[PDB]
Amino acid sequence: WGNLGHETVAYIAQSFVASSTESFCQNILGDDSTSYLANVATWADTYKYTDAGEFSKPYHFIDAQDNPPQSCGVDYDRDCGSAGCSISAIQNYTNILLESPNGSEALNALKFVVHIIGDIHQPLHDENLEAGGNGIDVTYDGETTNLHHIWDTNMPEEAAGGYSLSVAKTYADLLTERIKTGTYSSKKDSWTDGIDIKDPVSTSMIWAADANTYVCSTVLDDGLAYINSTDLSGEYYDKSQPVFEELIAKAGYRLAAWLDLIASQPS
């Protein structure tokens, strides 16, 4: 996601973690503000574009070698690659937090988990084609951009009604109520089914495979003839909106559940 989407995921997670989880995270981050997770949600995207952080660029995605829109699927060995991927990073950084929660590595590990659980839920972060859709140029409300970027940024910002922090917080709030009592409330139990703190690869693969299904059902279903040539602020946005809203909600809820498990490590 872009900045607003990561902030939204983080605020959702803040609303669903247990209090002891909040304390566990605030202690690592050195921040007990109202925005303790949101303040670090976008960090990994800023860090990766430096000499120090470049090793972590692969950790934002898993380049599924499927054939969308006619065939979607993710396979960890096939798709992760030797430089690593979102799934391998969730394993590594989760295990750092389970083994070494107050060592020097914990702070970055936590910021990576907050960010990457968000990224796994953006379907094009679970797809190889054209570098996760970065190579597919499109027009969005008259602007030339690419398909990856509209899923990260243009469409979530349109749906939220802006780009600023207050806009992200309002959007998170909306999605938290959909989880608690509204349109996602009957599904949220399923969203945490299968979560296993002793198996971060399997756990995060549930989420990656889930998000990847939407590559075929929503991202690329229209075909590139249409996608390359039509302004995607029209019907493409209209049908995409409920999909990315539910995926952002899932990301925040799953992030909260995962943080609860890390903070509850037997100790």
SS3 (DSSP) at 146: strand
Task: For residue 114, give the nearest of 126, 97, 128 by alpha carbon.
Answer: 97
- Check whether 262 is labelled as a binding-site residue: no
Burial letters 9-39, b for 16+ CB under 10 A, else e: bbbbbbbbbeeebbebbeebbeeeeebbbbb
CA 172 – CA 198 distance, rounded (Å)? 29
Report the nearest approach of ligand NAG to the CB of residue 80 (Å).
Answer: 10
Q: Which is nearer to Zn ion, 9 or 259 (CB)?
A: 9
The tokens for 73 are: 């699927």
- Kindly identify the residues of this chain, within the stretch 168-207, that bind Na ion according to CB under 5 A: 186, 189
Considering only 60, 111, 178, 250, the residue that binds Zn ion (CB under 5 A) is 60
Q: Are 11 and 251 in contact (CB under 8 A)?
A: no
Q: Which does 135 bind (CB under 5 to 8 A by kind): Zn ion, ligand DCM, ligand NAG, none?
A: ligand NAG
Under DSSP, is residue 259 helix (H, G, I), strand (E, B) or coil? helix
Please tell me whether 125 is known to bind a ligand.
yes
Closer residue to ligand NAG, CB minimum distance, 161 or 226? 226
Give yes or no for residue 225 binding ligand NAG (CB under 6 A).
yes
Using CB under 5 A as the criterion, what x/- string covers residues 115-134 for binding Zn ion?
A: ----x---------------
CB 126 within 8 A of CB 212: yes
Closest CA to 132 of 61, 80, 70: 61
- Helix, strand or coil for residue 145? strand
Contact status, residue 25 vs residue 38, Cβ threshold 8 Å: no
Question: Could you tell me what percentage of the chain is helix, strand and coil, using 3-state DSSP and rounding each to the nearest 5?
Answer: 65, 5, 35
Binding ligand NAG by CB under 6 A: which of 27, 35, 92, 213?
92
Nearest distance from residue 142's CB to ligand NAG, in Å?
A: 18
Q: Which residues lie near ligand DCM (CB under 6 A)? A: 1-3, 45, 49, 60-61, 63, 119, 124-125, 131-132, 134, 148, 152-153
Q: Residues forming the annotated binding site?
A: 1-6, 45-51, 60-63, 73-78, 115, 119, 125, 148, 152
Q: Which residues would be at the binding site for ligand NAG (CB under 6 A)?
A: 84, 88-89, 92, 105, 135-137, 224-225, 228
Q: Which residues would be at the binding site for Na ion (CB under 5 A)?
A: 186, 189
Q: Residues forming the annotated binding site for a divalent metal cation?
A: 1, 6, 45, 60, 115, 119, 125, 148, 152
